Design a protein around this nucleic acid. Structure first.
Lengths: 129, 129, 129, 129, 129, 129
RNA sequence: AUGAGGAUUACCCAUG
RNA sequence: AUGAGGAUUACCCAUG
RNA sequence: UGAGGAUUACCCAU
RNA sequence: UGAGGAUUACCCAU
């Protein structure tokens, strides 16, 4: 009926879960932010355009913040100490079938499944070796 | 330890699984590849470097073949019609701790969890609506 | 095999052991980094090149940080109060055989063995006397 | 006491042990030399000075010679076919306590411990891989 | 698990065998040298890059030395009287299957098998006639 | 003698063997070719000349067809997609004796022996790792 | 449009 | 990227 | 090469 | 400071 729904971005098992929701769709860019202060919210944006005459390009961005409380001018303001930025671009030929695309997805899911090299490395501040 | 081992990229539950294994490590850029012709194989590469003075940045690339009507081992042109290209860039501030990084991974896992918008959109040649 | 693996930089028995692992190997420069916040991690880089026509030259570099917590404006970040920098360059003629190198290595080990001058001096904020 | 004494630069058990002893200490530069013909002896020099207002800097230097006999015009002299030159500079902030230095030292010892990368690499005319 | 292992380059049946080992991997160039003095060692290097948009090019080099003992300045130095250089470049289309590549290998093995024209000629300082 | 005879280039053990035979000798450049259309045949050429004043240099070229999905006798374009090109250049100093040359051959044989890195890498569309 | 190019991340740089 | 082009072999030359 | 320097693969002198 | 150099307490670049 619509795919633009809220969804859980960080799953910690019922408690402390980071759920993100639709917040804007201006300029063809779907946005989702966490239920926080715009200054310290999690943000996910997605957009797709037909770049070439034969390709479609999905552009996804995610912002993970480190929440904090800065004291500017002697006043307490909610803020982000720093943000982590994920930026992925997916280019899919138009000849790709639905089944075809499903692979692209599954592949991406596998690439980050627990215990596999890449996420392992990332979660330990190291490279692959 | 050592994290540069083979893993399951596409999980179809036992049968039909696509395993990708290490194939190159020139320039600290790890490369995994499926057991197909380079022309039509699943490719995964990853590397890390300190982009600026405040950040480290993981660069991950994934190549996924179009399989529908594919001709195993054949020569199919144009190349741009039979391959999808994924390109992730993960920027993480030097202040991020191991825990911090685990969260960032979870966020990515969730972004792509089966059933959520982004992946289900890609999986249907759709955008957001 | 590979000699680009993790190893123990600091041996505290089996407790405070400081382990450094591969980071990246771009531009012929191997880099090892300890775990957790890059901001306050140990670093070890190594590289080898043919300096003259008769010599090869190793260039090792080690960084030992002083872990501390920077608090500014009520925002705390894990940082390094300061860092100690080791920088050694080793020149070895091409006429050196494996046997010769072993020797050179043993010399380096001796130079720093517990109880000897240079090491016991450095260890006490002292010089020679 | 004094830490300007003789020590073992190369430990061959109790046989080929290379012992280096005090030579002179002029201009704040300690020098150790092995016995016999200077022309083909081991050399070790060390010195410490206040580089900046916050740092002190050690400068160690080691010379490993390749003993050979030069015969020219029927006249033989004990000389060094060639020499291997080690040159290390260590910078330590003045805020470092004895405890801190011990650490820095242990790091150096580890860096060169048998079996680890850098040492085992140098020992085989090899680099990293 | 890894293909970068030591291997026997010249097989003389257990005795006098010339075995070569990994020695460096800087700049994406795998290197192997014999257990000799860098000045008179056997050397093998390999590297592969994706030259065209549709080709992959393996570049292999081998150095066979004639060991000797030169007397420079009246001193004995280990050295090579001369070196023999092998340089091969292999270009393989990306459409090449694994089975496809296997042929390329077998072909190369056959090309040099004992008793066949080419190696026969080489081993006798003559051309083909 | 006479060494310009047919030989087995690809040995599949009796059946499936690929024999290549002499087909041209213009300009002292010997050419062997398989029994296929020039378009999809195994080709081998070899020649020797004195490159410089100190060296002789064998130039060997090998062309190997892609067979997977090949259509026997058909016209398949583009040519660059169905063929692999090997190009060896062996430089040998004039001082090399027959024995010396035999060794050089052995070195080449070993470089490509079944099971060693280089050949097993090529055989798997892999590089070194 | 490409970039193991960058960020103060729906923007800036370089390139062909 | 090609060269029965070169070497003091991870470099130089010529060419299109 | 520098018992020149640091916010360390980078800056200052021959 | 220099993954600039050596005949190493000294030479070449910012």
């Amino acid at each position: 009926a619509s795919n633009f729904t809220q969804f859980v971005l960080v799953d910690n098992g019922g408690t402390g879960d980071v759920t993100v929701a639709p917040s804007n769709f201006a300029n063809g860019v779907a946005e989702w932010i966490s239920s926080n202060s715009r200054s310290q919210a999690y943000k996910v944006t997605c957009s797709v355009r037909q770049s070439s005459a034969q390709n479609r390009k999905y552009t996804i961005k995610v912002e993970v913040p480190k929440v904090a409380t800065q004291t500017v001018g002697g006043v307490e303001l909610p803020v982000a100490a720093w943000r982590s930025y994920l930026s992925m671009k997916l280019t899919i030929p138009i000849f790709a079938t639905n089944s075809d695309c499903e692979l692209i997805v599954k592949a991406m899911q596998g690439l980050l499944k627990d215990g596999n090299p890449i996420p392992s490395a990332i979660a330990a501040n190291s490279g692959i070796y």
